[PDB]
Structures are given as structure tokens and as C-alpha cells.
Amino acid sequence: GSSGSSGPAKFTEGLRNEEAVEGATAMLWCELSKVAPVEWRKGPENLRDGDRYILRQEGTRCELQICGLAMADAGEYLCVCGQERTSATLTIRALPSGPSSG
DSSP: OOSSOSSOOOBSSOOOOEEEETTSOEEEEEEBSSOOOOEEEETTEEOOSSSSEEEEESSSEEEEEESSOOTTTOSEEEEEETTEEEEEEEEEEOOOOSSOOO
């Protein structure tokens, strides 16, 4: 926090529940009152800028991509930023693997 603006960050839009398909890459983004290092987490689990987890930040907006979705992923994701934090609810859709219909 050097050469910026004194004070923590505040979620302007916040997270938002969503859904997806098994095997696909979910999409969760959240804006803030200023560019700050956020921390993506999932309840008992812990996410971070890694391989399977494609994290990105173009500024006051943080984009999160979960490579390899599954029934598990479906739950509640939280994003910690500064002194604030938000939560959301993701929904997974079992792949059509098998019964060809859609």
C-alpha cells in the first residue's frame, strides 16, 4: 500500500451467486473502492492464485477462474479484501455425460 491512498478497500458491487457445468470454468468477479490484494476462499477450503485457480486483477476488479468444476465446487465462495469480505453461492450442473439430450 505504498504510493496510493491511505485506507482499506471496500466492495462496491460484491460477489454474486451463479451457476455452471461440471468440468467447466466458473466465473466470479468483484469490484472494490480501490485496487487491493484480495483473497478467494471456499468455507473450509482455501483458494489462491495458482495453477488450477486462474486468478486475475486489472484493478478495482478481481476475476477468479476455477479450472475443473465439479459437484464439489458447488457451495459458497468468499472473497476477503482489507477489512471487509463478501460471500456468494455457486451452482454446478452435472455434465450430460451419458443421456444425450439438451
